[PDB]
Design a protein around this nucleic acid. Structure first.
Ligand SMILES: Nc1ncnc2c1ncn2[C@H]1C[C@H](O)[C@@H](COP(=O)(O)OP(=O)(O)OP(=O)(O)O)O1
Ligand SMILES: Nc1ncnc2c1ncn2[C@H]1C[C@H](O)[C@@H](COP(=O)(O)OP(=O)(O)OP(=O)(O)O)O1
Ligand SMILES: [Mg+2]
Ligand SMILES: [Mg+2]
Ligand SMILES: [Mg+2]
Lengths: 496, 496, 100
DNA sequence: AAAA
DNA sequence: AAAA
DNA sequence: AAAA
RNA sequence: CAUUCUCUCAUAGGGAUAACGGUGUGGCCUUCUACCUGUUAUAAUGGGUCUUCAGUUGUAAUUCGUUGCAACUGACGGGGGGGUGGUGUC
RNA sequence: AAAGCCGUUUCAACCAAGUGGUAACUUACUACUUGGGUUUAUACCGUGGAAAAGCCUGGGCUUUUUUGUU
């Protein structure tokens, strides 16, 4: 049977992926436990393996049980689907933290139902993605957030004065009227077979309004819901870029942007998804840095981790704070935190100008930021000496950043924080009875940290060079010109 | 080296494809020669195998020679490309027939140069197709003509009065200014690497104005050239669908369509591609069948094999004439033409109510339109009894035809032409000394042809049923619902 | 061309031919502003545009920006006061307002 | 090339 | 899934 | 009547 | 309640099975890359150097878009608090 | 009174509901042939071979048949 084989394949692939993820999780937990014991000494806590809680809620949640008997599950699912009696089991809903907006309700469906939703979402997207607007960049295999950022950046750079309009829907997934959805199935030349229609209605049967949160089919439903809005905005002549609920509209005319506001309001009244007054900034005017403005003005706007201005694209300030938090915590964890314990038993005290903890911290920062690339490799790629370079670091999630000044400031911050953390480590070592101020990592001044660390060599490689954002940014630009956003962020798989 | 391996693979694949095509050609020529001898008897001409003429022009044109030493060719090509001295060899330009506009100049590049052009076109399209307008349906792996026809049909059906503007570019490929092209390389956020840019310039070096005809890189350059025009038309708020030069713009407002005319005029003045007043129909007004119009009015429009009206989509009249020509010629060739020869020696004269030539003609007709599908298979698919049905016929090139009346007229035409051809065959047999008017195929009246032919059975199958357009149209509609147009017309992503 | 040979950009300052060159340079801008329907009055670089419609004045801003990008003469944000709304002495205004 |  |  |  | 295999009344229930899946490090192959310097009969191994961008200069091609080469110039590691000096202004 | 509608009979290969005029054509003219792998017999392109023939030279060229092809 054609359907049953497809369901078998999808369920088996999903279960095997989850099993591989779990095995990677526990293997890396063991490895990190070994490293932690080598770091924290006798104060290191014991290895603690956690199986996800919902695996005990039902056996079908467990990837191992599903992989045990997946043929039977697929057979029963196909039999129920072809009898028009199939109904997905109740998901496990948890209170995912959303302190920005209070709380958010996410749902983890059972493995068979999640697999069925993924399969039918793939089918529906495949046979209908040609009807989706090219400016909808959410939940697609042909559209990315980076395409949206590139489009916005290019269009903003073309002109000097642009009228913006930012709108976030209050509860986009949880307030779609089912009458509207059932009416949308026969519009825009959408090709939805009766089987897919029945499956969609099956996933909406438990609730009376809104679509489930955490299933693949809900992504296609969300994309399909905002088709009339996309068509209306396109026919108004405005440029927009919708990513799930986050909508940005920009045009060179005030009348067009007012009509866009009216169109979004009408669409919200038609679908019942009221806009969020707090998140939606309203209508603004994006000018240059010092151009006078007659209405509410802003010099830059934020869109999915990017702070876009007229001249350049830069990392969002909150994302910059996240990067700073991660790097600073790496330094604190590998340099300071072990020395704040009650006892230093089992810890290696730096001596003979060999601080392995500093080396570990620098290597982990490079792994976080570059991804493990030495400066030699990046320079070789830039010179054209080499043709292969892999981009998987924090920068691979912002390939389109062309703000060199922000990266310069970030590099200066990294160097300064490294110097200050080393000073605190030296102070703590002195307080613990070890004078090391004259040794290698601590005797360095802030100005000479990079210069001397570049020369330092271990095992025929320069593992001590302080990584820099500007170099990897140059590599990102060359990669983009040769590979293109897709391949560049292909490993990155931004997703989120 | 990465580049040389890629060139090797591309050249080998292209040469193997050409070799397979040639082997299929000569095998089917031999088979058709056997059938012809079984048809014309002693008057059948001898088998004549044609090798393409340009294979003798140069060895690199020959697929067999290229497959003989493709490693050396790829090595030399890579070496020349890295030295920035590579230059494609002169193509073989012939006079492809364009009686509608005189003649058309097409160029068949050598296999290595064609392979290089295909490879770099694939790369450029892959890393830049996200920048192409979603309404450019030519020379893409994500768009086809059927998506354009679906879009136009849906939008026309939405309203009742639409302002059209149909334009064609005169010698669009051969009049693009190279200055414009070289200026376009740094716009719209296009990602073209120096190697790709050098290759593009290499393919334009022989001429001074216009892009070559018959290479994939030409297709990419054509798509890239009309990006500013696409952006301007989108920002005007008009709906358009451009396929190569063919551009259909339709809007609900006269002012928007006049501005679209001005935009196309400005783009032509910028790129030097003038519009031929002959093929360009100007600005019209698409209304319903009997709605009064205040300006030049038309009830239907033609767009690439489809005659689109407000209410329904139908086959273009010229394409209908092509279908009629093919079917009528099949009947004439298998029924009448053998009997018009000087002698009937070696021919099987129908007897005992068994006209094999009629059976052969009916089977070939069914192969032409159905593709070999019996009515039982199509009815089984329609009922849902079966889930597999393949669409490879004349109607697989028009999956979006929803004009049932036109197909009804075509079916009536098929039945009537079959009856008249059978009458002429009976007359010729009588003139040749054989009375067969009382036998099976000839004694049938026009009304009873379909019924008795359906009742007729040979070898446990109904090979005599007269094929019908309506049945395959129902199958096509169900196939569109259960699978996106893409797959149904997938093997038919070519042209004319 | 002789009077422009010494330099590679811009026209010489303080000679008569530069006056005609400056007048000729801003001809496409003048035509565009006229065909927008806005009223304006240019005196060398100093330009004032006034219309009764906000859309026309926004289009005039865009036209001047396009002309500057075409000719390479950027506008200084300091001396350029931007778009305002000239009302009477005590008429309420919805956007940035000036009385003279 | 979506799960949460 | 692009030419000849 | 038109600038240094 | 093997996460292995198998059976079926098949999103559930039986059977026997001790392996099933996965991680870091290393070797082999395959990519893979500029220069300089250590050791051996010329190749491994060891230690170093540089790579980017912009402008100008001159040069060679260019199908006039541009490209190559050579030399110079410039850019190429944040901010905040306190003290202090010079410069700056009445 | 018509138009119209409903029959019934007859001519035609199609274009042709047409043309000044009416036939031809599919390796043509100007986009496709059976659900996917797995091997008995049939058989193809080109190249080998073995036979014959017909030319040049005194071995070479050309054409047919056979074989591997398969
Ligand atoms: N990382 C993620 N994992 C799972 N689902 C996600 C993730 N990010 C977003 N989503 C889903 C659930 C979110 O509700 C939806 C996007 O909506 P969101 O931007 O949160 O606004 P909202 O309209 O739901 O507002 P609110 O969160 O205040 O209710 O996409
Ligand atoms: N087989 C083809 N498929 C697609 N595009 C083609 C093909 N051959 C040529 N082209 C491109 C380049 C040509 O300019 C054009 C062919 O369309 P055509 O109707 O011949 O008009 P044209 O552009 O040649 O104008 P004109 O005949 O007035 O000079 O499209
Ligand atoms: Mg929202
Ligand atoms: Mg054309
Ligand atoms: Mg006739």
């Amino acid at each position: 049977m054609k359907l049953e084989q497809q369901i078998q394949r999808v369920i088996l692939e999903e279960a095997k992926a989850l099993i591989k993820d779990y095995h990677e999780y526990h293997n890396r937990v063991h490895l990190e436990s070994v490293r932690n014991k080598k770091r924290l000494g006798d104060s290191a806590p014991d290895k603690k393996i956690h199986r996800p809680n919902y695996w005990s809620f039902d056996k079908k949640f467990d990837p191992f049980y599903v992989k045990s008997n997946y043929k039977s599950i697929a057979r029963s699912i196909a039999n129920k689907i072809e009898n028009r009696t199939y109904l997905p089991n109740e998901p496990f809903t948890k209170d995912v933290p959303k302190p920005d907006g209070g709380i958010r309700k996410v749902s983890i469906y059972q493995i068979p139902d999640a697999a069925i939703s993924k399969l039918f979402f793939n089918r529906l997207l495949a046979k209908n993605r040609h009807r989706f607007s090219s400016f909808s960049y959410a939940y697609r295999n042909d559209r990315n957030v980076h395409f949206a950022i590139q489009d916005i950046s290019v269009d903003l750079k073309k002109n000097e004065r642009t009228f913006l309009a930012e709108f976030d829907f209050s509860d986009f997934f949880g307030s779609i009227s089912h009458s509207f959805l059932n009416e949308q199935f026969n519009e825009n030349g959408f090709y939805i077979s009766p089987e897919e229609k029945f499956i969609i209605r099956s996933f909406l049967r438990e609730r009376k309004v809104g679509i489930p949160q955490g299933t693949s089919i809900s992504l296609f439903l969300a994309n399909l819901t905002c088709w009339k809005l996309d068509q209306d905005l396109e026919r108004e002549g405005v440029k927009f870029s919708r990513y799930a609920d986050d909508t940005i509209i920009w045009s060179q005319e005030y009348s067009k942007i007012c009509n866009a506001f009216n169109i979004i309001t009408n669409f919200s009244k038609s679908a019942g998804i009221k806009i969020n007054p707090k998140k939606s900034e309203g209508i603004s005017l994006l000018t240059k840095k010092g151009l006078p403005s007659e209405i509410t003005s802003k010099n830059n706007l934020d869109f999915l981790g990017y702070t876009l201005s007229v001249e350049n694209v830069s990392i969002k300030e909150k994302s910059v704070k996240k990067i700073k938090k991660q790097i600073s915590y790496i330094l604190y964890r590998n340099l300071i935190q072990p020395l704040k314990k009650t006892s230093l038993a089992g810890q290696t005290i730096p001596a003979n100008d060999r601080d392995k903890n500093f080396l570990i911290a620098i290597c982990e920062i490079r792994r976080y930021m570059y991804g493990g690339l030495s400066k030699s490799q990046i320079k070789d790629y830039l010179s054209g000496r080499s043709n292969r370079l892999y981009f998987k670091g924090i920068m691979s999630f912002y390939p389109l950043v062309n703000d060199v000044e922000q990266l310069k400031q970030l590099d200066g911050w990294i160097v300064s924080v490294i110097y200050r953390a080393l000073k605190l480590r030296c102070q703590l070592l002195s307080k613990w009875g070890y004078n090391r101020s004259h040794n290698f990592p601590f005797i360095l001044d802030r100005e000479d940290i990079v210069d001397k660390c570049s020369k330092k060599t271990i095992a025929g490689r320069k593992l001590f060079e302080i990584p820099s954002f500007l170099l990897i940014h140059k590599a990102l630009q060359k990669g983009l010109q040769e590979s293109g956003i897709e391949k560049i962020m292909n490993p990155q798989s931004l997703n989120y």
